[PDB]
């Protein structure tokens, strides 16, 4: 009676990201896939090729001038760039200071990763999967007109728009490092999406940024300090999601599993193990409610691949051996060659009392949902 799990993967995505002549250059989705197969997880899920997204899909959320710019970005146009190209790279926040899809096939990279998310939504809509996974997605911080990180299109908004065609109520949860402001804002004035964001304290997503009009109280924010550990996160996550499920009764869940919240990420300050990150998914998966699982940020490639391999196993109801079976990227897991990671020595600035404080605030906010003028 296992859950039906559909796993979306474009095998050419590494080719779009690094070019056809770098087949062994480590690419986060290609390596994640490698680890998943090394644990025989293909035996427990359906592997699906996504339908590619196109510009018309992107333009539901994104500005035409931005999407046209992305179409123009090629190795020939951005190498020795004309000043007009450099100015656009700045205006649209496209970083060209690393090898990556900018220098290979940016637009098809976008079509493939976003297509995975929108294809996952369509499959959940047709009830052909109970859980749909797209690790290449989860780009929640991409703006209508600006890129961010690994992301150039906001596949999360696009996926949620797709789900709203068939589902009355969507619960979106995110455990990546930054606030997915762009997702929260896309849905801020509706009660047909509840957003719950666990993120580093920053410029957006304060604990009283809880929604507008029909959306009042349907945006939840947990702005957390440096050094978040498994214990702290669990103490907040489980009670808040327990109450959200009881009160909001979503028809479908989207979980963004951004891996920049892991210990030792060079662009995050949190201290989660893979067990502590995965515990969030384990709790969500315990509900027999349709589920989309997405990736996101995460800048220590071996830790990202371990994290999403482990979470694939959680999705399919398998336990994995911590001793890594042979894979095609073994040197990157030296010297211990384990699936799980240890937290660093980083102090947790989120005190026990800070966690109780935020918990009581969010639980109180959810109580106010019961008094909303109308029900979705």
> How do the SSEs run, as a string of H and E?
EHHEHHHHHEHEHEEHEHEHH
Number of domains: 1
Provide the CATH topology.
Arginase, Chain A
Strand numbers in spatial order across the main sheet:
2-1-3-8-7-4-5-6
What is the CA-atom radius of gyration, in angstroms? 20 Å
Percent range for β-strand residues: 5-15%
CATH class: Alpha Beta
Number of helices: 13
Helix fraction bin: 25-40%
Number of strands: 8
PDB class: gene regulation
Keywords: Histone Deacetylase, gene regulation
Assembly: monomeric
Entry title: Arabidopsis thaliana Histone deacetylase 7 (HDA7)
Overview of the structural elements:
With 376 residues, the protein is α/β, with parallel strands linked by helices. It has a single domain (5-49, 111-369), classed as Arginase, Chain A. It contains 13 helices and eight strands. An eight-stranded parallel sheet has the order 2-1-3-8-7-4-5-6, with helices on both faces. α9 links the parallel β4 and β5 (193-200). α2 packs across α12 (301-316) and α10 (230-248) packs parallel to α13. It starts with a strand and ends in a 7-residue tail after the last helix.
């Amino acid at each position: 009676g296992k859950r039906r799990v559909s796993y979306f993967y474009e095998p050419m995505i590494g080719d779009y990201y690094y070019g056809v002549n770098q087949p062994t250059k480590p690419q986060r989705i290609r390596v994640t896939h490698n680890l998943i197969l090394s644990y025989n997880l293909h035996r427990h899920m359906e592997i699906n090729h996504p339908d590619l997204a196109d510009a018309s899909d992107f333009e539901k959320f994104h500005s035409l001038e931005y999407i046209n710019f992305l179409k123009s970005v090629t190795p020939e146009t951005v190498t020795d760039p004309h000043p007009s190209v450099s100015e656009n790279l700045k205006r649209f926040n496209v970083d060209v200071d690393w090898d990556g899809p900018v220098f290979h096939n940016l637009f098809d990279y976008c079509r493939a990763y976003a297509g995975g998310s929108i294809s996952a939504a369509a499959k959940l809509n047709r009830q052909e999967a109970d859980i749909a996974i797209n690790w290449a997605g989860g780009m929640h911080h991409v703006k209508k007109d600006k890129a961010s990180g690994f992301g150039y299109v906001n596949d999360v908004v696009l996926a949620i728009l797709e789900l709203l065609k068939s589902f009355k109520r969507v619960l979106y949860i995110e455990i990546g490092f930054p606030h997915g402001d762009e997702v929260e804002e896309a849905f801020k004035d509706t009660d047909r999406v509840m957003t719950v964001s666990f993120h580093k304290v920053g410029d957006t997503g304060d604990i009283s940024d809880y929604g507008e009009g029909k959306g009042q109280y349907y945006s939840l924010n947990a702005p957390l300090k440096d050094g978040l550990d498994d214990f702290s996160l669990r103490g907040l996550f489980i009670p808040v999601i327990h109450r959200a499920m009881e009160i909001y009764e979503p028809e479908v869940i989207v979980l963004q599993c951004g891996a920049d919240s892991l210990a030792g990420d060079p662009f995050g300050t949190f201290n989660l193990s893979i067990k502590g990150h995965g515990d969030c998914l384990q709790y969500v998966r315990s509900f027999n409610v349709p589920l989309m699982i997405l990736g996101g940020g995460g800048y220590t490639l071996p830790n990202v691949a371990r994290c999403w391999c482990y979470e694939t196993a959680i999705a399919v109801g398998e336990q994995l051996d911590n001793d890594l079976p042979g894979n095609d990227y073994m040197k990157y897991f030296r010297p211990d060659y384990k699936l799980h990671i240890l937290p660093t020595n980083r102090q947790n600035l989120n005190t026990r009392l800070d966690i109780i404080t935020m918990r009581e605030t969010l639980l109180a906010q959810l109580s106010l949902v019961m008094h909303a003028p109308s029900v979705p």
